[PDB]
RNA sequence: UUGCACUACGAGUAAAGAUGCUCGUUACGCGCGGCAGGACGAAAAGACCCCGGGACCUUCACUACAACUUGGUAUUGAUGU
């Protein structure tokens, strides 16, 4: 699943390349950091 | 407690231990005080024995489950050799 970063991280990468999260490592780590989104209407606001 | 009733004894007979059957013997009728041999005395659908049901108990019986433990996957992530 691709998603929409805010800061460059050694797993996720840039903002908008190809996201390969580990299934929980996002909402327990990333989404508290305010650096990642579970994509709902984000594949075009990313643009 | 109670099927009766005017409820003898013997030797027998009978479900094998007779107040009631048989053959005899012995007893006027009723009553009150005693004993307690019998009435398979009363009580208590024998406690024992055996059959049938149940009960609880045990366990190198049966099958379950609890509980204790084993891993599998979800919550469970990163970076690294």
What is the C-alpha to C-alpha distance for residues A15 and A24, in angstroms, rounded to an integer? 19
- Closest CA relative to residue A35, chosen from A15, A12, A7: A7
Where do we find the tokens 């990468």? A13
DSSP labels, A1-47: -----SS-BTTTBSSSS-----TTTIIIIITTTT-----SS-TTTT-
Q: Is the CB of A33 under 7 A from strand B?
A: no
What residues form DSSP beta bridges with A9?
A13
What is the C-alpha to C-alpha distance for residues A20 and A18, in angstroms, rounded to an integer? 7
What is the structure's resolution, reported in angstroms to one decimal? 3.3
Q: Are A36 and A12 in contact (CB under 8 A)?
A: yes
Q: How was this structure determined?
A: cryo-EM
- The residues, any chain, with a CB within 8 Å of residue A47's CB and separated by 6 or more, are none
Q: Is the CB of A20 under 7 A from strand B?
A: no
CA A26, C1' B24: Å apart?
Answer: 126
């Amino acid at each position: 699943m691709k998603l929409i970063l805010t800061a460059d991280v050694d797993h996720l990468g840039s903002i908008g390349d190809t996201v390969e999260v580990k299934d929980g490592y996002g909402r327990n780590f990333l989404l508290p950091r305010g650096l990642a989104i579970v994509a709902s209407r984000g594949a075009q606001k990313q643009a």
